[PDB]
Amino acid sequence: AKRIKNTTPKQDGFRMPGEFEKQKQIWMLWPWRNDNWRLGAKPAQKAFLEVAEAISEFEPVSLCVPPLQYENALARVSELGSHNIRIIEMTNDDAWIRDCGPTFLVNDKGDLRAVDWEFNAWGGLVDGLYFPWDQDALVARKVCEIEGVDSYKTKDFVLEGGSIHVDGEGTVLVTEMCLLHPSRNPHLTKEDIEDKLKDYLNCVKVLWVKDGIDPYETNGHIDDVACFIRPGEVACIYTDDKEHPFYQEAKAAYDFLSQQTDAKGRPLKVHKMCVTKEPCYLQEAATIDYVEGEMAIASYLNFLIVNGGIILPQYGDENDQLAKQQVQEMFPDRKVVGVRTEEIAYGGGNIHCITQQQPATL
Amino acid sequence: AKRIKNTTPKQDGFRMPGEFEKQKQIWMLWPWRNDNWRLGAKPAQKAFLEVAEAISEFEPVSLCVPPLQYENALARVSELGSHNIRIIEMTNDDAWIRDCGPTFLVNDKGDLRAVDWEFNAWGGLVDGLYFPWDQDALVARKVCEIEGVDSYKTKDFVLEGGSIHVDGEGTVLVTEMCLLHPSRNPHLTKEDIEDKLKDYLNCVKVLWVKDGIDPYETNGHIDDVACFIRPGEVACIYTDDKEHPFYQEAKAAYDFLSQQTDAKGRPLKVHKMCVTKEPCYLQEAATIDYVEGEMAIASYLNFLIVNGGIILPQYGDENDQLAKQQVQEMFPDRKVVGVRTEEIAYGGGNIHCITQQQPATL
Amino acid sequence: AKRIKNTTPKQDGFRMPGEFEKQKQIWMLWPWRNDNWRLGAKPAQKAFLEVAEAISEFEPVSLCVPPLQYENALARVSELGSHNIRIIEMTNDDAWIRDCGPTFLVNDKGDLRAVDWEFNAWGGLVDGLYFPWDQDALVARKVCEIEGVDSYKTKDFVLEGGSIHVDGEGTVLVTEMCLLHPSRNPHLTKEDIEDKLKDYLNCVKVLWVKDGIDPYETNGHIDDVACFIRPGEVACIYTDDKEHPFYQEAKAAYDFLSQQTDAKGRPLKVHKMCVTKEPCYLQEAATIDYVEGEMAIASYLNFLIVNGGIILPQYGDENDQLAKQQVQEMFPDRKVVGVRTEEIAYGGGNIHCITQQQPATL
Amino acid sequence: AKRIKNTTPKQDGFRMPGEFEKQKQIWMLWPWRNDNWRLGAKPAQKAFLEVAEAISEFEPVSLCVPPLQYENALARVSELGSHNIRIIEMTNDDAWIRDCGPTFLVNDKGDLRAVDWEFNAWGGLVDGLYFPWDQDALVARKVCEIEGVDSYKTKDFVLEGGSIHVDGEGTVLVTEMCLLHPSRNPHLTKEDIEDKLKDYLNCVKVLWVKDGIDPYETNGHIDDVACFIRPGEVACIYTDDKEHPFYQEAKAAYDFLSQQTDAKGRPLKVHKMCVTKEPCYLQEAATIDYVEGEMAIASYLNFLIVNGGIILPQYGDENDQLAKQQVQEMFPDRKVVGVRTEEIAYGGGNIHCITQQQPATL
Known part of the structure; x- marks a missing residue:
């Protein structure tokens, strides 16, 4: 479990494989801080428990929980039959393995x-969500240790997992409203940044969507608006309601996507995901310590692509059952499962933002 | 802040003054563990916040909270105007300053x-409520440090504050169903134990009530059935409902009390407190991690006696307003205040079990 | 990673394989508490680092360190080339994977x-070395989790790994001066205890050595006086110096061993290990916080038996090089390595007491 | 213990009184991290213990130690007779109450x-000494809580205590090589900064010494080169050795000081302190974990001015006894005591950098 440091994945002959490709398991943290999760995080925990139990039937899950809520998580995972889910001890400031993770x-x-990558809590001292983010910056290194896998360290380059989507071949989907944000590499030019993404992902081309539905939190991550459902074909939220908060950004994205081609040359067969018709109304906001009824993001594009299965969010919206239908079209030969991950959407991020899959090998 | 060790309070000329006597302030911890408090303890916290804000108008409060929930408690106490309540950092396994405290x-x-005294979590490895109780055994020493007050250490003698009630002069009210319990000094005889209580309290006489309404938790503490409302006059729960769970123990106590005299000789003018007509039905028991609807103790005798005021529990029972009336009789020249401390009654203990007053001096 | 609970290893067809048998890797904790290790434990750490680096050339090592000294241990293990040693995050009250471990x-x-097994810090509240031992009682369960291996829980049966030595077939070596100690199963008879050892180890016979060289610490563990070097052949300390502190116990053991046969019937070809000629003189005892020059145990019998190698302690004694020679005889077809594990002998226990090997499988 | 927020000390009629003025007690933290202190910090601790025991004979000490090294510090302070030293529980990333403190x-x-003030570990993410500095930014607020004293919060203004020295009347001694450093208020002009110092200190004039002997650590704090020994008279290091590392900065300072007048008008009767003739050679640097023989600052100007006493550093240098003589001249009517605070000088800072006095009141 060492660290390669004099060469880049491009030279070393490595490449971030498509999320859809075959994978050994999935990694996910454990919510605990009252600064962000209501009711001692108990609800969010149960919400995490399910989203975990869901991956169960497709592959194994590596649930990493802080030492203080360990005994608990293990008593609840055994309480669910306990199949191929292992609880490993791991500290974190917040549960977002998608970003801080490897x-x-x-x-x-x-x-x-x-x-x-370098993690600064989505911004840092300039615009980060919380302050002490040192334990999260450890999560990536720690998880590579108990897995026996070397790693490359992008010094001074702060990037989070759920801000980039990749397809098997030299192409990635980044969101300039985030990667260019001043609280994220303001010493690097849009040119420099592309080069990095090309060296550590092995993407000969970078598609720059241009606004996100995450204005001031994640700073417009792309894992909320679109992604690659197959090398060439992609997903993307789309609504016609000209009074819907995500309308323009979504359409602006759709127009960009559809008019865009990848590395190998094929056009992007853009798909269509739906958006809620009713935003999640945060309740019981009082139990959220500070250092109600306010809207919180709830995107169906926040789904995880395991092998032979899909884990999709079900907020209990009107256009909910439609989402499960739409995703079904995209991945016909994949059983789709849905969980009430609405309770975690109150924390700013969904199913995707809380998982991280490891590609199988042999 | 040293430790006297070669003499006892009796010889040194000290005596635990009556709870009612003049006092400088009140000490209380902060609930946090999910093992005992539901919903991340958020509810219980608010319940503690109030019971704290209540003492506010009578004297200052010393709220000690673990380092992890410090920023929070301070943001909530300032949110309530922030008068004479100070938040000092202090770790604890559970919030019961009444017992572990000095x-x-x-x-x-x-x-x-x-x-x-020695604290073993009400029993210890034999019958304790939880296991790691080492941080609580520190609370008493720690609080005597930041107050500049020496202390006597009863080595090998495990006793908890809320298991004994005292009146100005040589007399204390203990409950043999607890002090004699095998998980509490099974190497000491009922004779030995009395001697200790006489040396560290300066009580020339010990009244032995004989069963408690705390069968297997606190092991029948006396701070649930009765207490001294004035040197000579006492309180005591009493119901006539021969089908009420506390009936016999309460009456058995009343008969004992009324037939008992103190040290100075005066008879005990026994009073009458009421008991709920409906036991607290524990709800949302699922959010209570394990290593619903079950009844939990709810006694009105669990009140704190500050100077010029009374803090009484209000579970929202039928015989609730009656309790406030009864207590009013006892302490006419004392403003009585009541708080919904029902949420903490789900943790096994009330207002009294979570406070500890410090007698003023000059 | 579940827990079998209605049957015993004997019925399930499992058996603790000989320490010498083929093994996948070795587990070991990380010293940190100033209550036991001098100089902030820095020395002991380096001593652990080596003993770890030693196993390196024979098989992989699983170094589990508390979250507070993680970054450190990883910076030191990479500083040593970083071969097949992985640092996994794990909390513990003290580094003795041999006992608390699985x-x-x-x-x-x-x-x-x-x-x-149940761990109570070698005695518990009756004679334990330290008090809070709850995190150590977690180590065994935790390590079985990240390895995907079910486990049997001996409820109310407190036993520590380094208090029993086994040979492939139905036989184990226990030390009655410990397993019978009142601070370890005083509700179980010598008959009951044997049955347990027979059900969870699959040993049809238990050899009872009868005094140990650990009078009041480990309470006379057997992993200090003797062990099985091969099914039938064993090791054992032996000195003729009638003024040596371990003289009688060692000889008393030798006489017992040599006169004892195992399960399958073969006689025990007893061997001879040497003892130091100069006890380790504890230095700088002042840096050891309390809640100098005193002697500390230093036994050569405290060696680990990996596959194709031996890790032996080298205190810098007169009969030191002799120990390496003796052990060489026993395991001819095994490279013997020695490390200055004298610094950990100041903590009460050696190389064996700080490791735990996992038998390989396929 | 509230927070005044709509006015400044200047308007409110408050002023940082001279360090020499009468004071109620002294506050100091407790070293623990192996990232900075060698040998588990055990040595530095003892060094802190003494410097603490020293203040003992002049006024009370408020020793704040993290929860993990509490029992220890209390066992050592009682071991020293235990006079007027109280151990209060308080977490910190590092022991430098002088800076982070109130x-x-x-x-x-x-x-x-x-x-x-705002604390960012002397620089922050730009040039801070260590990363997680959130617990230290709590120390100031926490200590004002257990003392019943309101506070003013300089939002976005990062300043550390030991970077400014004041005399009773409208004058302060800052070091521009630090207060202007880019890692400390690079959004504020030298004009703006003076205004702040004038509003929160009530100093109608700010003397700008111009280089420090702390090139890249504290970034040239002034509490290393000079200070106010009396309103009008000051101290200052001075050597003639043109080959001494502090030569020019010291002389450059002396020339500036001597040519400078204060607010009330009187000239500054500059004094002369000596500098070591041999820099402290760091030893045993290996026991200092990383995320030898190198020189470390050792200034005699790092002394604390309690009432009726002086605590001066004694590194065991040639010009050591001279320092005690010099300081004696300055404060004739003040008993001078010296302690081997050389062990803490290996951490970057001395006696002054680790204390914080509270002015008495009535």
Whole structure:
């Protein structure tokens, strides 16, 4: 479990494989802080428990929980039959393995590497969500240790997992409203940043969507608006309601996507996901310590692509059952499962934002 | 802040003054563990916040909270105007300052001493409520440190504050169903135990009530059935409902009390407190991690006696307003205040079990 | 990673395989508390680092360190080339994986099980070394979790790994001066205890050595006086110096061993290990916080038996090089390595007391 | 213990009184992290213990130690007789109460206020010494809580206590090489900064010394080169050795000081302190974990001015006894005591950098 430091994945012959490709398991943290999760985080925990139990039927889950809520998580995972879910002890300031976590790589020859980015809590001292983010910056290194996989460290380059989507071949989907944000690499030019993404992902081309539905939190991550459902085909939220908060950004994205081609050349067969018709109304906001009824993001594009299955969010919206239908179209040969991950949407992020899959090898 | 060790309070000329006597302030901890408090303890916290804000108008409060929920408690106490309530950092396994806390003393000459007992979580490895109780056994010593008050250490003698009630002069009210319990000094005889209580409290006489309404938790503490409302006059729960769970123990106590005299000789003018007509039905028991609707104790005798005021529990029972009336009779020249401390009654103990007053001096 | 609970290893067809048998890796904790280790434990740490680096050349090491000294241990293990040593995050009250750790099992068909005993810090509230031992009682369960191996829980049966030595077939070496100690199963008869050892180890016979060289610490563990070097052949300390502190216990053991046969019937070809000629003189005892020059145990019998190698202690004694020679005789076809594990001998226990090997499978 | 927020000390009629003025006690933290202190910090601790025991004979000490090293500090302070030293529980990333701590104020009418600055570990993410500095930014607020003293919060203004020295009347001694450093208020002009110092200190004039002997650590704090020994008279290091590392900065300072007048008008009767002739050679640097023989600052100007006493550093240098003589001249009517605070000088800062006095009141 060492650290390669004199070369880049591109030279070393590694590449972040498509989320859809075959994978050994999934990694996910455990919510605890009252600063962000209501009611001692008990609800969110149960919400995490389910989203975990869901991956169960498709592959194993690596649930990492802080030492203080360990005995608990283990008593609840055994309470659910306890199949292929393992509880490993791991500290974190907040449960967002998608961002702070490791972004694995592969050389297509069996070896499994990884790229550990710098994490500053989505912004840092300039615009970060919370302050002490040092334990999260450890999560990526720690998880590569108990897995026996070397890693590349992008020094001074702060990037979070759920801000980039990739397809098997040299192409990635970033959101300039975030990667260019001043609280994220303001010493690097849009040119420099592309080069990095090309060296640590092995993407000969970077598609720049241009506004996000995460104005001031994640700073407009792309794992909320679109993604790659297959090398060439992609997903994307789309509504016609000209009075819906995500209308323009979504359409602006759709127009960009549909008019965009990838590396190998094929056009992007853009798909259509739906958006809620009623935003999640935060309740019991009083139990959220400070250092109600306010709207919180709830996107169906926040789904995880395991092998032979899909874990989709079900907020209990009107256009809910439609989401499960739409996703079904995209991945016909994949059982789709849905969970009430609405309770975690009150924390700013969904199913995708709380998982991280590890590509299988041999 | 040293430790006297070669003499006892009796010889040193000190005595635990009556709870009613003049006092400088009140000490209380902060609930946090999910093992005992539902919903991340958020509810219980608010319940503690109030019971705290209540003492506010009578004297200052010393709210000690673990380092992890400090910023929070301070943001909520300032949110309530922030008058004479100070938040000091202090770790604890559970919020029960009444038991683990220090039992102050006085020489009636200005000096303030204290007696630190051994705490084993109400029983210990034999019948304790929880296991790691080492941080609580620190609370008493820690609080005597930041107050500049020496202390006496009763080595190998495990006693908890809320298991004994005292009146100004040589007399204390203990409950043999607890002090004699095998999980509490099974190497000491009922004779030995009395001697200790006489040396560290300066009580020339010990009244032995004989069963409690705390069968298997606190093991029948006396701070649930009765207490001293004035040197000579006492309180005591009493119901005629021969089908009420506390009926016999309460009556058995009343008969004992009324037939009992104190040290100075005067008879005990026994009073009458009421009991709920409906036991607190524990709800949302699922959010209580394990290593619903079950009844939980709810006694009105669990009131704190500050100077010029009374803090009484209000569970929202039928015989509730009656309790406030009854207590009013006892302490006419004392403003009585009541708070919904029902949420903490779900943790096994009330207002009294969560406070600890420090007698003023000069 | 579940828990079998209605049957015992004997019925389930599992058995603790000989320490010498083939093994996948070795588990070991990380010293930190100033209550026991001098100079902030920095020395002991380096001593652990080496003993770890030593196993390196024979098999992989699983170094589990508390979250507070994690970054450190990883910076030091990479500083040593970083080969097959992985640092996993794990909390513990003290580094003694040998005792609190899991005692693996095998069905000789590929499956890997385990038996988790109760740990009370060698005695408990009656004679334990330290008080809070709850985090250590977690170590065994935690390590079985990140390894995907079920376990058996011996409820109310407190036993520590390094108090029993086993040989492939139905036989184990226990030390009655410990297993019978009142601070360890005083509700179980010597008959009952044997039955347990027979059900969770699959040993049809238990050899009872009868005094140990650990009078009041570990309470006379057997992993200090003797062990099984091969099914039938054993090791054992032996000196002729009638003025040496371990003289009689050692000889008393030798006489017992040599006159004892195992399960299958073969006689025990007793061997001879040497003892130091100069006891380790504890220095700088002042840096050891309390809640100098005193002697501390230093036994050469405290060696770990990895596959194709031996890790032996080298205190810098006169009969030191002799120890390496003696052990060499016993395991001719095994490279013997020695490390200055004298610094950890100041903590009460050696190389063996700080490791725990996991038998390989397929 | 509230927070005044709509007015400044200047308007409110408060002013940081001279360090020499009468004071109630002294506050100091407790070293623990292995990232900075060698040998588990055990040595530095003892060094802190002494420097603490020293203040003992002049006034009371408020020793705040993290919860993990509490029992220890209390066992050592009672081991020293235990006079007027109280151990209060308080977490911190590092022991430097001088900087992170509160900078008290007074209205000369009895009331005691304070000014809490922003702390970013001497620089922050730009040039800070360590990363997680959130617990230290709590120390100032926490200590004002257990003392019943309101405070002023300089939002977005990061200043550390030991970077400014004041004399009773409108004058302060800052070091531009630090207060202007880019990692400390690079959004504020030298004009703006002076105004702040004038509003929260009540100093109608700011003397700008111009280079420090702390090149890249504290970034040239002034509490290393000079200070106010009396309103008008000051101290200052001075050597003639043109080959001494502090030569020019010291002389450059002396020339500046001597040519400078204060607010009330009187000239500054500059004094002369000596510098070591041999820099402290860091030893045993290996026991200092990383995320030898190198020189470390050792200034005699790092002395604390209690009432009726002086605590001066004694590194065991050639010009050591001279320092005690020199300081003696300055404060004739003050008993001078010296302690081997060389062990803490290996951490970057001395006696002054680790204390914080609270001005008495009535």
